[PDB]
């Protein structure tokens, strides 16, 4: 209904990042007779014009469209200077760091669960015909040890090493090129946050992909899950699974691994 929030309900905490328009903070949203809610706050640093303020706020209008357990929610906006966008906080931070730090504490079933949850968020977007374009582990947040979410779409935004050949060669971005990127995101997850094509130059990436090279099978990845990944990386977009297919398959693989 009304997304406008009184600034006095927000307590700005530490800086946790930055985007195009300004710093991102963690903070708190307070309301009478309720517990304080942890939030992320995107700020528009020195936005001293209507055109910049409008470009900033359109990122809120984008997030407002979505209602899914595995995509971060818009809580509200403050439309007086300085303009803030207030989002739900994923308290455990960025997935890549979480996987690196908690590696000897996480099992395969947990990694597969992260992939499944993300696939449900992306199937949801696919059903809305919304193309993400920026699917990578670095854009996934950790809400709890058993819960990951796509981060803010403004903050998520060329990522050559993640991109489908059709996106690199022809600038085509579709749900099918989303599927490719997700394949890479699943590889990152199984590798506990190692980046794809490490030590390889961006301009060389397409040469390798067109030569038929693909990211290798992670250690202790189930063959059935690597097979699903190689399907995501079919050179021909028409041959890749849809996110609807991915979610059903991942559901089966997860059950198998439990
Ligand atoms: C897609 N990426 C994002 O949306 C994003 C990127 C950088 C920083 C914040 C950020 N957005 C969020 N971030 C969070 N939670 C985070 C993210 C990063 C961190 N960090 C902790 C300090 O080191 C850097 C990253 C903390 C945190 O909550 C404590 N929750 C919700 C949103 Cl919408």
Numbering used by the authors: 413 to 569, 584 to 684
What's the paper's own text on this?
Focal Adhesion Kinase (FAK) is a non-receptor tyrosine kinase that regulates signals involved in cell proliferation, migration and survival. FAK activation is initiated by breaking an intramolecular autoinhibitory interaction between the N-terminal FERM (4.1, ezrin, radixin, moesin homology) and kinase domains. All compounds exhibit a common 5-chloro-2-ortho-methoxyanilino-4-anilinopyrimidine core structure, which binds in a nearly identical manner to the hinge region of the FAK kinase.
TAE226 is a potent inhibitor of FAK (IC50 = 5.5 nM) and also inhibits insulin receptor (InsR) and insulin-like growth factor-I receptor (IGF-IR), albeit ∼10 fold less potently (IC50 = 44 nM for InsR and IC50 = 140 nM for IGF-IR). The methyl carbamoyl moiety in ortho position to the amine in the 4-aniline ring of TAE226 is located near the DFG motif of the activation loop of the FAK kinase. Its carbonyl group forms a hydrogen bond with the backbone nitrogen of Asp564 of the DFG motif. The side chain of Leu567, the residue immediately following the DFG sequence, makes hydrophobic contacts with the 4-aniline ring. Interestingly, the interactions involving Asp564 and Leu567 stabilize a short helix that includes the DFG motif. This conformation of the DFG motif, which is induced by these contacts with TAE226, is similar to the conformation induced by the bis-amino pyrimidine FAK inhibiter PF-562,271 and has to our knowledge only been observed in FAK. In order to adopt this helical turn the phi torsion angle of Asp564 is rotated by 113° compared to the active kinase domain. Together, the backbone rotations of Gly563 and Asp564 move the Cα of Asp564 by 3 Å closer to the N-lobe with its side chain closely approaching the N-lobe of the kinase. Interestingly, the FAK inhibitor TAE226 induces a DFG conformation in FAK that is distinct from that observed in Abl or other kinases. Our work demonstrates that TAE226 locks the activation loop of FAK into a helical conformation, which to date has only been observed in FAK and appears to require a glycine residue immediately preceding the DFG motif.
